[PDB]
Amino acid sequence: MVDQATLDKLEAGFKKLQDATDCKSLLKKYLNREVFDQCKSLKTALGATLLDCIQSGVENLDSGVGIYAPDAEAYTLFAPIFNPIIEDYHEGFKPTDKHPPTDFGDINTIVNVDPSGKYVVSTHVRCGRSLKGYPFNPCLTEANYKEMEDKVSAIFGTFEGELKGKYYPLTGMDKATQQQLIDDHFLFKEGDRFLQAANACRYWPTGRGIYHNDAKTFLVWVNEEDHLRIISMQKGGDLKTIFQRLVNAVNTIESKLPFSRDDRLGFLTFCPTNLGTTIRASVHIALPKLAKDKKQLEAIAAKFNLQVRGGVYDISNKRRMGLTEYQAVKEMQDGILEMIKMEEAAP
Numbered sequence: 001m002v003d004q005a006t007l008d009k010l011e012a013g014f015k016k017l018q019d020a021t022d023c024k025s026l027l028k029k030y031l032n033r034e035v036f037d038q039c040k041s042l043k044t045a046l047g048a049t050l051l052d053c054i055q056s057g058v059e060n061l062d063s064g065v066g067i068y069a070p071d072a073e074a075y076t077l078f079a080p081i082f083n084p085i086i087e088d089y090h091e092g093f094k095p096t097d098k099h100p101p102t103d104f105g106d107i108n109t110i111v112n113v114d115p116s117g118k119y120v121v122s123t124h125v126r127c128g129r130s131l132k133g134y135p136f137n138p139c140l141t142e143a144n145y146k147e148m149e150d151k152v153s154a155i156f157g158t159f160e161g162e163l164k165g166k167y168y169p170l171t172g173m174d175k176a177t178q179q180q181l182i183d184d185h186f187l188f189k190e191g192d193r194f195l196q197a198a199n200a201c202r203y204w205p206t207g208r209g210i211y212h213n214d215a216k217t218f219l220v221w222v223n224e225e226d227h228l229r230i231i232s233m234q235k236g237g238d239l240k241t242i243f244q245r246l247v248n249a250v251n252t253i254e255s256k257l258p259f260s261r262d263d264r265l266g267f268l269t270f271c272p273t274n275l276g277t278t279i280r281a282s283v284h285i286a287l288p289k290l291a292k293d294k295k296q297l298e299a300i301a302a303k304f305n306l307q308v309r310g311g312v313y314d315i316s317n318k319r320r321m322g323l324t325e326y327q328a329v330k331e332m333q334d335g336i337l338e339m340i341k342m343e344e345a346a347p
């Protein structure tokens with residue numbers, strides 16, 4: 001039962017997207033009249049609406065994607081619009097395609113990508129998780145935010161070993177605490193207009209917070225965009241230790257707090273760009289010789305499905321869906337190994 005006020009907003013949002021002749025978002029590309037009418041009168045069990053999916057791309061016509069998920073069920077219920085957007089962004093993950101089961105693989109096949117520290121400044125592996133049972137940030141209530149922070153911060157306080165550390169709520173955070181976290185690049189702020197128009201910043205900063213371990217090789221953002229953004233990083237290129245530290249953390253959390261995961265799509269996230277493995281494995285790396293070639297580099301990036309973002313690059317795996325967590329990490333590993341091999345043999 002979707003109320004008339006929402007239907008009126010949905011109709012004006014649809015028409016505004018049509019009238020924007022300039023607009024290149026995936027939302028505009030696939031929200032035709034047939035899809036719109038398939039979706040406009042549906043509502044999820046937790047109460048989410050099509051407007052709770054598309055408002056941010058309606059308000060921000062310069063959005064690249066322009067759709068977000070207000071809860072886990074929205075991906076299936078509003079599948080007529082998510083499915084073509086998902087296929088396009090993830091380049092070939094079709095509506096009938098299926099994401100494999102979670103598999104972190106054999107960690108002993110993961111290596112230090114640059115033992116000498118000659119090239120790789122730092123390595124990062126990042127994932128995201130939504131907690132089963134809660135709305136996503138478009139639809140969390142204030143009480144939801146508080147209870148989740150309670151549960152999650154409680155779990156964080158039981159981390160032992162290399163994961164031992166401290167939770168910092170954004171609520172009541174003082175300016176000195178803020179600065180020390182900024183200095184570490186650990187702080188996040190209020191979201192930009194895309195997140196604002198998606199209703200992902202309500203009740204700010206209730207339920208938002210930051211966890212890191214004493215060694216500062218492990219970071220979690222609570223309700224920055226997803227319920228959890230879990231990151232493992234360190235200087236150099238020991239991908240093995242980094243990935244193993246991440247999977248230990250994820251497993252620990254899961255043992256106390258189930259994740260929202262879909263058979264077809266993998267782990268469900270607020271942005272559909274982060275589905276599947278959710279995994280972004282990256283290195284900060286200097287390839288000066290390959291920077292003077294630029295033709296041999298992208299031959300490797302494109303061949304190993306890496307995205308390349310002077311001399312010092314941030315290089316990360318492009319694929320999130322259709323491959324396992326292991327294969328994503330192994331793909332980054334193999335690509336970086338090859339590029340360093342090319343760098344070492346270059347002129």
Ligand code: NA
Pocket residue numbers: 185186231
């Ligand atoms: Na970071």
